[PDB]
């Protein structure tokens, strides 16, 4: 197959999985020092779609409104995922508890998933792709990407 053909076939697999919301090969576990995490129950191969980071897709005005409200309640966790799309700031706000697993995946700078922006006919999606082969039983991890001094002071696990 040509690159274009392989890319088309990959886009097709990804679009189908985004559509179905199917989240196979994963389960929730308690991970020491992290709260809940998501662990592989099957081997994933490098390049495989893992999961969508699924939640409320919102723009910047609403994101700030929600942040200011979440900041007032210390029991509320951190599930807001910011990105740039077509020169604007967007956020997948996964604060609401649902059965979707992307929102539960923990942080490492040296993890096994990489987030990508995936556009379907003008609708942006954040998806996690395996950055290497992932063993059954190991925790899914990606780089949260917040390197700010303000965050790292309060959340030192962001440093590694």
């Amino acid at each position: 197959k040509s690159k274009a053909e392989l890319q088309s076939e990959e886009r097709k697999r990804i679009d189908e999985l985004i559509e179905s919301g199917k989240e196979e090969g994963m389960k929730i576990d308690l991970i020491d020092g992290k709260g809940r995490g998501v662990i592989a129950t099957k081997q994933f191969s490098r390049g495989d779609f893992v999961v969508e980071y699924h939640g409320d897709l919102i723009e910047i005005t609403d994101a700030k409104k929600r942040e200011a409200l979440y900041a007032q309640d210390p029991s509320t966790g951190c599930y807001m995922y910011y990105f740039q799309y077509l020169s604007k700031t967007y956020c997948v706000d996964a604060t609401r508890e649902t059965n979707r697993l992307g929102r539960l995946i923990n942080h490492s700078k040296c993890g096994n998933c990489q987030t990508k922006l995936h556009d379907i006919d003008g609708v942006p999606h954040l998806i996690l792709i395996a950055s290497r082969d992932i063993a059954a039983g190991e925790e899914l991890l990606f780089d949260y990407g917040d390197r700010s001094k303000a965050s790292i002071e309060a959340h030192p696990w962001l440093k590694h």
């Binding site: 807001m80 995922y81 910011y82 740039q84 780089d143 990407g145 917040d146 965050s151």
Partner: peptide, 8 residues
Amino acid sequence: KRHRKVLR
């Protein structure tokens, strides 16, 4: 003190 998740 909150942190974010941010695409890079």
